[PDB]
Structure formats: structure tokens, C-alpha cells
Amino acid sequence: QGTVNWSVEDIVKGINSNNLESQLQATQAARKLLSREKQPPIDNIIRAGLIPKFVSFLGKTDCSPIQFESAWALTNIASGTSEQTKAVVDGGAIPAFISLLASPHAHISEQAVWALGNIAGDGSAFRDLVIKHGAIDPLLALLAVPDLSTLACGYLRNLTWTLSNLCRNKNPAPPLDAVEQILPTLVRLLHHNDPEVLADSCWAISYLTDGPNERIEMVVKKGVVPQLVKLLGATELPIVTPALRAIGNIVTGTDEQTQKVIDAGALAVFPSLLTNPKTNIQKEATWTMSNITAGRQDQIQQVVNHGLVPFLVGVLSKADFKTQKEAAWAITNYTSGGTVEQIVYLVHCGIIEPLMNLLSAKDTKIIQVILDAISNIFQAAEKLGETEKLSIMIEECGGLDKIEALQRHENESVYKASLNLIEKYFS
């Protein structure tokens, strides 16, 4: 009841009082104001001029509670808009929080970890500014223990989450040397058994692999792909989501980097991923499939062997409409790279009729994707004479009507493929 709902005016009167204990009470009252869930008055606290005082209290080494209270208060200002985070940074909080990482009070260090996570989380400029102030070495030193299990769960989760914000954004991506510094302890967190540490470690890896191939390689050469594939089969949705995002990012790289994903056994998880009831998992799993079917013929062959072509036929036949696109892409890239035997196998699995059904959509971009795929399929059946059988399939499922109704379309690409298709195979 002592510090429950102070007015900002009372907080200001206490913080300006020349009594350190009065300032502590006012700072705790500020922290409780900033901790309530119904619209905490961050902007009023900023306008009263309290941030420099809070930042100054961070250095009060012989009053450890006012360090904690102002650290917590600043953490929650930094949790708001970019403008509010910037107010914390402009008060000089970054070097003061980094000095607090080494505190003998675990709860104070943890709070400095958290506040730096919020600042780094605002974006790449503050992320790189936290890095330039030297935050990475003291953060990583806090994880330099023989066994992470001796650390308190919340502490470890907070360190993992803040390291992942140092890995996060993309224009620009984090400094190469900082990524190299963090990765080894990140690999270690990826083997820790706590669902939240694992999820945030997968998020970090997902950020690091979202870029050019040299960035994927930094991660892939640390050996994490098998562990990512294991995490891909977790029952915790907060784990599979970033695990799948990372795997999907890695298979956007070279054929060789894609192959490590396949070597690691990832394709065996896809029967359940391509039927997963969370539509986002199923969308991203199908996108990931479309970058594997863009690979080599031996890689397309592995998709066949794992029985994933009926699963693509399934997603094409019935799924979220955005997911059906990814499946259309998966098919068209398959048709682009595959052998003739692999391509006619699509027809044997029933690809034709769900492709024709999707010609009824309005998104111009897929009529392209789809008509390309049937162009490639006709072209590969032609090398075995099976052009007629395919033309009657497309005719019997009402796909012929779609293809020819389509050369009155508002696109050069649509109706030159439409009308091309008709002359060699429908006359």
C-alpha cells in the first residue's frame, strides 16, 4: 500500500528530494506505475524528466535496491515505442546497463540483461549500438558455466531471449564478428532442455539464416542442422515454429546446404508438417518443400522416396489458399528440375485435377505458375508419346475449359501460355 498508485507529481517530488531513501521509494512507485497492465503512463514519466535520474540510480553501487527499481522502471519504458526506447538510450542507459551485467546481485544483472534485450529489440541501429558498447562479452560470460542447468530458469531464458535480439534484424544484418562470437554459446543453448530457451535459440538461428548464403553457411558449419531437425519434431508449437523457419531459411541457400537438411533426416517429419492443423506450420512447410523441389534431381528423388508427392497433392487439393500457392510453387519447381520419370509420377499421384481446380482462382501470379507446370508436364509426357492421355485427363476434369477461357485474360503471359497449350495438345 505504501507505493501503490502514486501520482507522477509525487514520484517527481520524491526523486528530487536529496534523500536517497525517499528517492528509492519514489522510484519503486514509478516502477509499479510502469508495471500495471492498463496503459502505463510511460510518456508522462518521460516528460517529467525522470529518465536521467533513473539512469543515474543505475550507478548507485551501495544502494542495490534503487539499482533494481530504476533498472526495472527503465526496462518498461524501453519496452514501448521506438520513441520511448530512444528516450532510454538518449539518457545514457546502454553503458550503465552493461556495467550492471557484472553485478553480484543476480536479480539486478538479470534486469540489465532484460533492458538490453528491449533496446536491442527495437531495431538494427540500437542493436548494433548495444554491440559497439561491448555488451556481448559480459552477456556471454554469464553463460560461461560447466552446466546451464545450475542457472535459474528465468535467468537463462532472459539471457537467451536477449542474445536472440542481438541476432535479429536485417538491414543491416548483425556484424559478422558479433555473430561469430555469439554462435558457439547459441549452439550450446540449442541443446538445453527448457522449452523456452529452445524456442528462443531456434528464433536466433532463424534470424541468422535469413539472408545471403554466406550467412547460412556460418550457421550450417557449426553443425546445428541435425539438432534443428530434432527440434522440428517437438510437440511444443513454440519450438517447431522457429525450428521450421530456420530449416526453411537454410534450404533457400545452395544445393549443398539444402542437402545437409535432407541428410539430417528432415523429410521424414514432413508428412505430419504438411498436414499440421496450425495453418502457419503447413504454409511454411510447403514453402520449404518448394525450395527443396527447386533442388537437384537427386534431391527431388528424395522427396519422391519419402512419399511427399501425395502430401503435396493433398495440400494442393485442400488447404489454406495461401498454402495452396506454396504447393503450386513446389510443383512448378519440381516440374522444372525433375526427370521425365519424376514428372509423369506427379500425374500418377493425381496432381492434374487439383491443379486444374486452382486455375479458378483470381491471383494472376499462379495461373502463370500452374500453366508453366502443365507446360512442363506436357513436354515430359511428349518424350514418351503420352500427350493424348494427359489431354483427356485435363479435358475430363473441366481443366480444358479453364485453359481456353484463359486466353481472354488481361495478361500477355497468361493468354500466350493458354493459347500455346491449346495448339500442340488440344487440336
Binding site: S35, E37, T75, N118, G121, D122, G248, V251, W287, K322
Partner: peptide, 28 residues
């Protein structure tokens, strides 16, 4: 050719999941 996650999520996000960008502390 392969489509990176930015081309992926160009015709998909907003709505694509990510970790927590910022975190408010409400309890001890």
C-alpha cells in the same frame, strides 16, 4: 530458382510469426 523468406512473406505477411521484440516486466 529459390525464393528467400522476404519473397516468401511478401505475399504472406503481415501475420508471419516471430519471437517477442520487446517485453514488459509485470511481476517480480
Amino acid at each position: 530458382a529459390k525464393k528467400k523468406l522476404r519473397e516468401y512473406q511478401q505475399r504472406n505477411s503481415p501475420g508471419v510469426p516471430t519471437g517477442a521484440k520487446k517485453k514488459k516486466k509485470i511481476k517480480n
